[PDB]
């Protein structure tokens, strides 16, 4: 699992994930898998999808993980009361907006890309879709 | 660079005079010529000026760049200010240290009616 090496502060507010995406087009590779729904992807899910696509393509090209988990999500320990401070950090997630590109690749043919992203998408809660880079 | 430093060390007095809203008599000093002129409180109008670049007070001076010419310039500008009604005016060093030529000019202006 990937996470920031260090941060200014350990705990952060819950916040709200509303709005539209910022990076909605593939700018590195030729084929891309982009989230169409709304949710929060975790580092474990990202790593699982990356491993799935890598073993599907046999590393016959390059892989780009556009998103990065940088939001620390904390959960209180089981069987404890309310209050008494904020719970300890549990994991790290990345806020996801609809239309944001998740994974990018190139080199592999269209069939291989679509058969790899098809099995790599099942490791993520948010529904995804396959797109190809265009001329602007 | 020297001119920039002089402006840097004189803009404090410039702003002080501007915020006081009085009349200021400024002194431009160069090794060859020394000017002097009073400025309206708004800072955009000139009421009287005198310098060593004019024949009127240049034809009776040995050299322009000395305390003797600065004294004559101060006397002339003070007399013109008095005859035009200007009597109360502060003195701006314009970044030049108050000594020698500028000090002599200021003393001549003070002695010729213009009280500081």
């Amino acid at each position: 699992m990937l996470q920031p090496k260090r941060t200014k502060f350990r705990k952060m507010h819950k916040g709200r994930n509303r709005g539209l995406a910022q990076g909605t087009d593939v700018s590195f590779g030729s084929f891309g898998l982009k989230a169409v729904g709304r949710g929060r992807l975790t580092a474990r899910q990202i790593e699982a999808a990356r491993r799935a696509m890598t073993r599907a393509v046999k590393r016959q090209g390059k892989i780009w993980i556009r998103v990065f988990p940088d939001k620390p999500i904390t959960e209180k320990p089981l069987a404890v009361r309310m209050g008494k401070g904020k719970g300890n950090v549990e994991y790290w997630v990345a806020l996801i907006q609809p239309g944001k590109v998740l994974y990018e690749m190139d080199g592999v043919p269209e069939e291989l890309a679509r058969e790899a992203f098809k099995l790599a998408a099942a490791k993520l809660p948010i529904k995804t879709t396959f797109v190809t880079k265009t001329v602007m | 660079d020297k001119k920039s430093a002089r402006i840097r060390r004189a803009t404090r007095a410039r702003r002080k005079l501007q915020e006081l809203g009085a009349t200021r008599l400024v002194v431009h000093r160069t090794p060859r010529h020394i000017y002097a002129q009073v400025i309206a409180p708004n800072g955009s109008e000139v009421l009287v000026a005198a310098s060593t670049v004019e024949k009127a007070i240049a034809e009776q001076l040995k050299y322009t760049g000395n305390k003797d010419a600065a004294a004559a310039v101060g006397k002339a500008v003070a007399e013109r200010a008095l005859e035009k009604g200007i009597k109360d005016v502060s003195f701006d060093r314009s970044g030049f240290q108050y000594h020698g030529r500028v000090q002599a000019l200021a003393d001549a202006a003070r002695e010729a009616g213009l009280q500081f």
Binding site: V80, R81, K84, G85, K86 | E19
Partner: protein, 79 residues
């Protein structure tokens, strides 16, 4: 159970703009209270010990942006 730190806080000093510009003020009236000199003193405006701009003459409060650094100045128009 447990204990948690950083439970302290400080009382607000009620800073900000008081006259908001365009109002008629009196001599000695405080216009703005601030920590740093966000607004500089202009015409008929004095600077307090804690960078408070107080009008020294009755008139109108005006906000303008002058200076080489585009700093905000408070001006008292004695109309």
């Amino acid at each position: 159970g447990g204990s948690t730190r950083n439970g302290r806080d400080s009382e607000a000093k009620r800073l900000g703009v008081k006259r908001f510009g365009g109002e008629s003020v009196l001599a000695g009236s405080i216009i703005v209270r601030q920590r740093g000199t966000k607004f500089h003193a202009g015409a008929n405006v004095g600077c307090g010990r804690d960078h408070t701009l107080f009008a020294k003459a009755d008139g109108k409060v005006k906000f303008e942006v002058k200076g080489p650094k585009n700093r905000k100045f408070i001006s008292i128009e004695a109309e």
